Amino acid sequence: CDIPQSTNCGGNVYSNDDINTAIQGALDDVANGDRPDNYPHQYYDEASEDITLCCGSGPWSEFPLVYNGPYYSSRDNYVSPGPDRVIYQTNTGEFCATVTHTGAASYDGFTQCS
């Protein structure tokens, strides 16, 4: 669905530019450091997290939502991912939601940003 003007992720407020930049960076695949699991990562629905997506069907992916993005990595060089994410439909890039680890119900959980 439409990228929102803003979102409040556990206190961090991001713009539509920040959200678009994250998905564009994910699709460009700018995270290439030697984490064995570089971003983007798969996103799965976990009903207990109470997260609603606005895109259609999966598969879904998630990528760090950061200021002055995109988040990126290379050998020996990492932006900090922080707690905040964009979720998008893997096949298309279509925006699904913003989520965060901040304030989540359980360890490693996500909760929906505003």
Active-site residues: which are they?
41, 62, 101
Q: What is the per-residue binding string for Cl ion in 21-60, x denoting contact by CB under 5 A?
A: ----------x-x-x--xx---------------------
Calpha distance 3→11 (Å, rounded): 19
Name which position in 5, 57, 80, 108 contacts ligand 3AM (CB under 6 A). 108
44 binds ligand 3AM (CB under 6 A): yes
Count of positions on this chain that bind ligand 3AM (CB under 6 A) = 12
- For 22, 74, 84, 90, the CA distances from 67, given in Å and listed in that order, are 9, 18, 10, 22
Between 5 and 19, whose beta carbon lies closer to ligand 3AM? Answer: 19
Task: Decide: is 98 part of the binding site for Cl ion (CB under 5 A).
Answer: no
Distance CA 48, CA 90 (A): 22
Tokens of 54: 């606005």
Site for ligand 3AM in 2-31 (CB under 6 A): none
109 is an annotated ligand-binding site residue: yes
Q: Is 65 in the site for Cl ion (CB under 5 A)?
A: no
- Closest to 22 (Cα-Cα) out of 62, 73, 65, 61: 65
**Centroid of chain to Cα 57:** 17
